[PDB]
Structures are given as C-alpha cells and as structure tokens.
Design a protein around this nucleic acid. Structure first.
Ligand SMILES: [Mg+2]
Ligand SMILES: [Mg+2]
Ligand SMILES: [Mg+2]
Ligand SMILES: [Mg+2]
Ligand SMILES: [Mg+2]
Ligand SMILES: [Mg+2]
Ligand SMILES: [Mg+2]
Ligand SMILES: [Mg+2]
Ligand SMILES: [Mg+2]
Ligand SMILES: [Mg+2]
Ligand SMILES: [Mg+2]
Ligand SMILES: [Mg+2]
Ligand SMILES: [Mg+2]
Ligand SMILES: [Mg+2]
Ligand SMILES: [Mg+2]
Ligand SMILES: [Mg+2]
Ligand SMILES: [Mg+2]
Ligand SMILES: [Mg+2]
Ligand SMILES: [Mg+2]
Ligand SMILES: [Mg+2]
Ligand SMILES: [Mg+2]
Ligand SMILES: [Mg+2]
Ligand SMILES: [Mg+2]
Ligand SMILES: [Mg+2]
Ligand SMILES: [Mg+2]
Ligand SMILES: [Mg+2]
Ligand SMILES: [Mg+2]
Ligand SMILES: [Mg+2]
Ligand SMILES: [Mg+2]
Ligand SMILES: [Mg+2]
Ligand SMILES: [Mg+2]
Ligand SMILES: [Mg+2]
Ligand SMILES: [Mg+2]
Ligand SMILES: [Mg+2]
Ligand SMILES: [Mg+2]
Ligand SMILES: [Mg+2]
Ligand SMILES: [Mg+2]
Ligand SMILES: [Zn+2]
Lengths: 89, 101, 119, 43
RNA sequence: GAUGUUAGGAGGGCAAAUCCGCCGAAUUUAAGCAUAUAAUUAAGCGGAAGAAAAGAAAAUAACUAUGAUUCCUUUAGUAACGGCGAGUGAACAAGGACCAGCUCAAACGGUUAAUCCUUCGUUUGGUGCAAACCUUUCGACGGAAUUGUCGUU
RNA sequence: UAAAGCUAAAUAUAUGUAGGAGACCGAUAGCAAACAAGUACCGUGAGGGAAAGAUGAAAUAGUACUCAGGAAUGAGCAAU
RNA sequence: ACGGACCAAGGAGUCUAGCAAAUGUGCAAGUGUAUAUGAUUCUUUAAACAUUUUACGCAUAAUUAAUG
RNA sequence: GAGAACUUUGAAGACUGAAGUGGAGAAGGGUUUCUUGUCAACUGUGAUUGAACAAGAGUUAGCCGCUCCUAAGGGAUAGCUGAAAAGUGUUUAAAGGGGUCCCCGUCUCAAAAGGGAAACAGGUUGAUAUUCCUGUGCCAAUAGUAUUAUGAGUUAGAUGGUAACAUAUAUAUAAAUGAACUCCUUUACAUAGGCUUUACACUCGGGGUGCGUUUUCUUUGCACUUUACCU
RNA sequence: UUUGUUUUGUAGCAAUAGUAAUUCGUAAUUAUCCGAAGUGGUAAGGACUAUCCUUGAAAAAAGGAGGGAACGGCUUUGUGCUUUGCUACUCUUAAUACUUGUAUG
RNA sequence: UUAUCCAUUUAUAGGGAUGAAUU
C-alpha cells in the first residue's frame, strides 16, 4: 500500500478541519462541528481552563489595547464629575 | 406599534457613513488604466471596499459632469476596490480625464 | 489652516459648507498623489487636520443643541444621560442609602453620638 | 483555491502587505518576513 | 392566565489573587493494600465584593461565672479520632486587635391605608464659564395595596 | 430562645493598576519574555513556544579620497 | 564491564516546621515580653527602644484508666 | 555578459506519444501571475536563470459559480432533565404564512459534483476574460393613475377539428373570465445488455488555394477549405 | 387561393467574422471557403429487454386540471349597500407622462 | 374513577338500528 500511514498518508491531507473563527480569529473553528476549540464560539462563554495557565495568560484582559477599559483608567483618580470641561483661558 | 417618549440613542454627530468624498478614493493611472481611458472610454477609480455599484455611480455623477453606462468593480488584494467605469457615448473619457487633472 | 476659536461663531450651515470645500480639496490632493506627483503631497495632512477640527466643532455644536432640547424631563436619550460605570448607575443614590426607617430616624434625633470630653 | 471567501481574501491581502520590507528611509531615523513556499499561513 | 417591536426598566459576557456555593478525584503515605491518607485538596461548574463570608446566642460555662461575629497570641499537637497503624485533630476559657447594633413576623391602631409607586408638573434655593448637579414642598391624574402597606414594641 | 432578615470595624489578597524596596538576579541568571515576546516558528487541534542586550564621549565623527578590481573587497604616500 | 570526541559556561544534602544531643551566650526557680500597645520612632526605621501609674509556653512534682 | 554544459536564439539530433511534464478545473496553496530591474544569501555543480530579492502592476459578470431549495445530517425554539455545564427535540406549547374570520404551519443552517431564471461567437492584454470590446441574444423583474397604439371578447368570459388534438405569427403567438378549496404532474432518479438515431472525432474520393519532394519516380505528400448560441 | 418553371440564400445569425492565400502601401484591395461517402472511437437521446428477499432521494419552484366565488363603466338620490337613466366596455402586450424615497440588474 | 401511566389524531359526529361527491 502506497497510501501507508506515513508519507503516503500525508499526501491525502487536504481540507481544513478548523477555520479562522469569528471572535478569536484563531484558526480553531472546527467547520464540521461548528465549534471553536479555543473559545467555544457558539456557547455564550470564552472556554478557559485553570489547568491551562499559559493559555489563560496568553488571552487575558491585558492582551490587546483595552480600547475602552484603558481610557476609563485614571478617571477614578481624577474623580472629575461626568460632563465637565476645565475652566477656559 | 412603538411609541417611545424618548429615543434610545440619538447620534447627533455628522453622519459617519461614507459620502462621495471617501467613497471614491482616487483615479487610477497605470498603463492598463491609461489604455482603457484611451481606447474604450472607461475611467478606472480606486474606491472604498464597501461601496456598491449604484453608490459608486452616484459618486461619479456628483464628483464630475460624467454619466456612466456601466460600472464593473473588483476587490484589489490591497484591500481597496477598483471600479471600471464605462461612460455613455455622449462623453469623452479623455476630456473628462483631462478635466479631473 | 483654520483653527477652532474662529469656527465657534460661524453658523452651522456655513460650517458645513466649509467642511465640504475642505473635503473637495482633500480629494484633489489625493488625486494628485495618485498621479506621478510629489509637489503638494505634504499639504494634505494639514488639510485633513483642518477638516477633523471642523467636524469636531460641528459635532460639539450638535451636542449642545441636543442637550438644550432635552433639558430635564425625567428620561433622556442614553447618550445625553450621565454616562458612568454601569455598577455606579445601578447603585442607589446616597440619599436613598441614607434613608432610615421612621423609628430609627426618631431614635437618631433623640440620642445622637454626642461629644463627651472626659477629664 | 481560485474561489475564496471575501474575509479570507482580505486576510491574504493583509498578509501580503505585512510581507513587504521596511521602507528604507526609516532606517535613517524585518524579522517577521515570510515566504509563500516555506512558512504557511495556516489559515 | 396568555399576548404585545406597548411605557419604563433589569438579567446574559469578560476578569479571580483574596472571597462564597456547589461538584469532585487520583498520584501519594501507610515501606504491599482494601479502611484510612492525599483531601472535605486539583480540575469542573456557578456566583460576589473592595474586601467577601461570618454576625447580635435555641452561645459557653458549672465560675465569685462569661456575653454577636471576625482575626491574631494561645489552648494544642491537647481532648478526641484512627487495619488505635500510617497518620489526623478541634473547642471552652485566658491575652489582645476591633468593638455596634438591630427589623421584620407575630401583640396593638378601623371615628376609616395613617402607606407606596408611575407619569405630568409647579417654585424657592446652592454651586459651575458652560455641561450638569445638588437639595426644598406641593398637588393633580392614574394605579399597587383589605390575600395587609404604614405607625406602635 | 431554632425553624425570617440585615449590619461597619479588625482579617485576606500569586489578579489588575499605581507607588516605594531589597545583605535579591546580572543576559545559559532574573518572568517564557532587558530586544518589533507570548513574538517568530512548530502542532488539524487542545496546545507547545524560542533565540536574540553592550561601537564611541560624540555618528550633528558610520569610513571621504586615490589605486587595483566585473563586483565584492583589498591596499594606500590617504582618513574620522 | 558501563559513562566519557573536545572545549566553555551552567550543574547536585538545600530551606522551613517541630524534636535532639553537642557547644556558645544571657538570665536562672525561673525564664521567654506572644500577640498587642507606647513613643519627642519614622531616608536607613519592615529596627531599635519601651512594656502599661496573676496573659500563655516550657520548667518548679510525680503518679494513676480513673473520682483523684 | 566579468565569467556560460545547465540564461536566450538559431540549427541539428531526441524524448513526452493523447491513460502526455498537453489543455481545463476541484481541494490545498496565496501573490507563486506580469513587466522592469536584478544577484548578499538561496536556487545541494555553475548561473547572467529563477517559483530568490526590489519596484511597481495585475483578478472587471443580470447570464460562469456561490447567493435559493432540500439530503444524509447539524445548531437551536417549547418542554423536560441536570448543582450547573450540558443531554435530549412534541414526550402534557396559547410555536409565521395563505385566502376573505377560516385554512394551513417548529425555526435555522447543511451540496462551488444533487435540484436550479437566463450567453454565445469573434477580437483584445505584459498579466483578466462565456466577466473587457464589437456584434448578436436570452432571463427575471417593471407601483398607481392617466394617455396612447396592439389585437381579443361583448353589443358574464373565442373558435376549428369525427377524433388524437389544433388555433392569437400583433416589432413581440401578448390575450382563450376564473376566487376558496382539492387532485395530480413536472422537478424526479438503479444497474446490465444490445439495437437504433444524431453529434463530434477520424478517414476516403474530387474540386480550389499555398507550401514540400523531384539523379530517378510520383495527375504527387502535407497544410487550409470554418460556421456558434439564439429564431 | 392551388399547380408548372427559373433564379437566389452557406435559412436568418453570416460574412462584415475566422483560416489559408495573394498583393499594394507605410492600413487597404482582390480571389478561396464545397460537391460526393465511409469508419464507429466518444457523447447524448430513443424505443426496448433483463436482474433484485437490492425496486434505485427530497424539497424549493413551476405547470395542468377539477371546482364555480365574484363580476361591465359613468351620473343622481337615500342609508359599502339599494333604487333610477345612459352606452363604449372587460382584457391584454408595448410605449409614454406624471406623483410617491432616487422605479433595471 | 379523579391520582397516575400508556396509546391515538387536525385531539373532529353521545349511544343503538381505479368517476364525482366542497362554498
Ligand atoms: Mg497511526
Ligand atoms: Mg472532519
Ligand atoms: Mg464581481
Ligand atoms: Mg480553498
Ligand atoms: Mg510545502
Ligand atoms: Mg455572569
Ligand atoms: Mg460528593
Ligand atoms: Mg503505598
Ligand atoms: Mg514504596
Ligand atoms: Mg478548584
Ligand atoms: Mg464583581
Ligand atoms: Mg456582608
Ligand atoms: Mg483559635
Ligand atoms: Mg504544650
Ligand atoms: Mg483530614
Ligand atoms: Mg448576612
Ligand atoms: Mg533568559
Ligand atoms: Mg549499568
Ligand atoms: Mg561511548
Ligand atoms: Mg557527554
Ligand atoms: Mg562551572
Ligand atoms: Mg543546649
Ligand atoms: Mg540544477
Ligand atoms: Mg517516442
Ligand atoms: Mg518510451
Ligand atoms: Mg504546462
Ligand atoms: Mg514568473
Ligand atoms: Mg549553486
Ligand atoms: Mg523576471
Ligand atoms: Mg518575492
Ligand atoms: Mg448559472
Ligand atoms: Mg427557507
Ligand atoms: Mg434532515
Ligand atoms: Mg443538541
Ligand atoms: Mg442553505
Ligand atoms: Mg449543481
Ligand atoms: Mg471576409
Ligand atoms: Zn473562537
């Protein structure tokens, strides 16, 4: 058998089992299953595990600009009332 | 039927949705485009990825005295749209090209 | 190269007109850039900035008018509402928190935590 | 193949853009280069 | 009881170190191993806060009695549990840190819900350049409430 | 005085941000990461996961010029 | 018999808990000021000092299943 | 060109031999395509070559697909389970459409080889072509009112044909009353065997063109003689 | 309206396009494009025949039929309905004009 | 039999004596 378990078999390897995945962008969206291996896309959750500490660290809050959270930070310190500018001149 | 005492959100800001300026980004030169301009009275424009054929036509109408017979479009692999715009027989693409600059 | 303080006085229509002109100018610049040119390639940035400024001014004006329109009247559009952390919003007003039962209030009135210098 | 999803096409374009080398003038004021034949995008 | 893109609202997700529930092992130790041990641990799932939880005695004591919780020092490696093997293992007192109490239900008030809320308002103030807040008392029109709100202890 | 409830303080923090520290580590150490590091790259995937700091005081001194070279480079009576 | 091509760097009885004897030191029928308080203590000060104008540990007594 | 066994051109000699290192596509790849450069490394020899490096440039559709339908199936709605996470999918549901109140009715995803509105020919680029251009078509839409023309029917709904059935040829066969509610049919179907018909392909004979052989022989050998959808 | 004869047409598309020529010029003209048939290699269709304890998808969409609901227009009067008078009407394509969001991809 | 459980359909007439079929 030319299609043996090694090299012969690697030749028949065509067709993604996982695609890119809306939400995570990590090619872990199992097409056939319609579920992300990394996020659990359809399930309204992120799918993260305390047994995968490295994984957790590589995906936590601080990774990725924090668009709004960052902006909010320091506001507490300022304690400025909402909707107020500083005095002109 | 809805009867809201106050509207949830009121984006009083000037519309973000792309107008003619921003829809149509710039004319394309390039030997191909030049050829098109010469031989077939078709003007080539780089345009917003999210512009529709109708929209592009409208923009063209607004931006220049041009009338368009047909507009073919494609998405470039630089993340921009290329619109091939064939002008009606009443107009001379070359003259309009000149006008545009 | 128009700056903010000159634009605050101008009517909204005029501002809009200005903005359109600026946009047109920008378009021209872009076109020039696209063609084999490098003459006014650095002028465009300034124009863009100006446009942005104009937009900001107009937006502010719009906001102000909106605010004026929706003065008081209990409920307000969520944008005009005092945007604050969700938790804070949820949280009871200080007054509400304070509000004690009548008996408790009476008690408080009667025997407050007095100062009693001990010598 | 020769029939891609729009998103995929966009991604490809982005990758291509990334590929191009440092504009030389900066050097006077890359390690992430890629080759289509040696490192796959795994899209 | 359904139903409504009715009017006004709320929940969902992310983040966990401390925190609170659940759910839940095994490696391991016993020179084997099965009870035990690991461990009421890890993982799993759910939920909070700047702390959480606990908390105002159906408490301990047997004293000349102490007096909500929590935490520290201690009791104490003690009582006890444990193929009484390996191992495990508190509590009361005592010294502190800090100290804070309370309100529902039930009893009573019918010469009368004395309550409460939505919406629309009305007019004195105080700040701020504005934006806004901050308070003040006063009635409407609705409802909720007698299957029980509020006052009294 | 059970079978209803609330309640600050002391107490805990290996998470996040912001400060301040060390009889700590000194680029095979210290976080995996002093550097475009959770980056490149590998794995279908869950995941795994690096290497890589230092010219000089000053490149606003980064090698001018000449000769030999196809060029790289080399050499100089030349040069910072 | 096994390990070792070579070189450079890294590379292995440590740290804590309680017990022990050894020895040093202080005090000694006592000893250790535990938490915690107090200060004219505050770069060092997370230490040093102080201990309220019969706390507890171990020891001073043993023994018994035990009331004792 | 500094430099050539492996760059290019010509001339030989050869192979691949229509089950092809030829054309097209799918999966996968992702700018590898193309032009101008071009050689630090790579291109296991060289290399001036390159799928390398650099700068640009390139992918145009109502008709080709996806887009719509359902299939094996999947994700969910109601429930019901379960501490939850999840596991099930009418098991005791008040589960949007069609007609003028009745009559139906889980939703949604799942085929770039199943089903399916409609496109062909020539030409053109450095690189795209059923997609651009020229030409010819086809399909689906096309609100209301008012004019117009086009023809029907009536003076409320044609005719022929014994019958099988046929008939509107107006620029264009447009028009042959029809609601509710039904019943069909198309979609829509295995494999094998031969037989037939068409099509392309190949060939043969002749005429017509050009080329090839010619010491000798050959009315000769080869090439071209084409015709698309649509009506 | 039917019969006889002739000339056309690669049935329109269509020759203006191709292909093979021949020239002339620095793109244009010209001439060619057609008379017979066989092989059955492909592909499709047709009518059939055989095999099965195997009988060989569904729906979207479309069509046909049964069925017979409803029924011209305008004007006037009374409370969509009824009565009275008059005769171009009901269709249907295509075109056009006008409002309504800008009514072809 | 009312709890419960099972089945049946559009939850379609209370029990006995090879056309069409609807407003
Ligand atoms: Mg295997
Ligand atoms: Mg699969
Ligand atoms: Mg397109
Ligand atoms: Mg693909
Ligand atoms: Mg490869
Ligand atoms: Mg949550
Ligand atoms: Mg359990
Ligand atoms: Mg063991
Ligand atoms: Mg052992
Ligand atoms: Mg856990
Ligand atoms: Mg929280
Ligand atoms: Mg609490
Ligand atoms: Mg304790
Ligand atoms: Mg002890
Ligand atoms: Mg235990
Ligand atoms: Mg509590
Ligand atoms: Mg390191
Ligand atoms: Mg050995
Ligand atoms: Mg050896
Ligand atoms: Mg070794
Ligand atoms: Mg060493
Ligand atoms: Mg000693
Ligand atoms: Mg080679
Ligand atoms: Mg051969
Ligand atoms: Mg051979
Ligand atoms: Mg080839
Ligand atoms: Mg190439
Ligand atoms: Mg080589
Ligand atoms: Mg090249
Ligand atoms: Mg490249
Ligand atoms: Mg099609
Ligand atoms: Mg559907
Ligand atoms: Mg199915
Ligand atoms: Mg499921
Ligand atoms: Mg689908
Ligand atoms: Mg198909
Ligand atoms: Mg011709
Ligand atoms: Zn994901």
């Amino acid at each position: 058998g030319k299609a043996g378990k090694g090299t012969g078999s690697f030749g028949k390897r065509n067709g993604k089992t996982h695609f890119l995945c809306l939400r995570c962008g990590k090619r872990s969206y199992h097409l056939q299953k319609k579920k992300c291996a990394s996020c659990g896309y359809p399930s309204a959750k992120k799918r993260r595990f305390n047994w995968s500490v490295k994984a957790k660290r590589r995906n936590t809050t601080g990774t990725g600009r924090c668009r709004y959270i960052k902006t909010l930070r320091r506001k507490l310190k300022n304690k400025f009332t909402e909707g107020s500018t500083p005095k002109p001149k | 039927a809805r009867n809201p005492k106050c509207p949830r959100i009121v984006k009083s800001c000037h519309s973000k949705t792309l107008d003619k300026y921003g829809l149509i980004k710039y004319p394309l030169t390039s030997e191909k485009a030049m050829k098109k301009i010469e031989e077939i009275n078709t003007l080539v424009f780089m345009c917003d990825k999210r512009a529709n054929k109708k929209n592009i036509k409208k923009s063209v109408k607004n931006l220049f005295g041009i009338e368009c017979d047909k507009v073919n479009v494609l998405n470039t692999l630089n993340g921009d749209k290329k619109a091939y715009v064939r002008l009606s027989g009443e107009h001379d693409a070359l003259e309009v090209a000149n006008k545009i600059g | 190269n128009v700056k903010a303080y000159e634009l605050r006085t101008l009517k909204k229509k005029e501002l809009l007109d200005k903005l359109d002109e600026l946009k047109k100018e920008l378009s021209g610049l872009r076109i020039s850039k696209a063609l084999g040119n490098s003459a006014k390639n650095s002028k465009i940035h300034g124009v863009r900035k100006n446009v942005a400024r104009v937009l900001t001014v107009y937006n502010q004006k719009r906001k102000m008018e909106l605010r004026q329109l929706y003065k008081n009247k209990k409920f307000k559009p969520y944008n005009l509402r005092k945007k604050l952390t969700k938790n804070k919003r949820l949280q009871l007003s200080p007054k509400q928190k304070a509000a004690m039962t009548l008996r408790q209030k009476k008690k408080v009135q009667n025997f407050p935590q007095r100062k009693y210098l001990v010598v | 193949g020769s029939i891609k999803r729009f998103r995929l096409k966009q991604r490809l374009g982005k990758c291509r853009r990334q590929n191009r080398p440092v504009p030389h003038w900066y050097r006077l004021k890359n390690t992430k280069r890629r080759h289509w034949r040696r490192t796959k995008l795994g899209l």
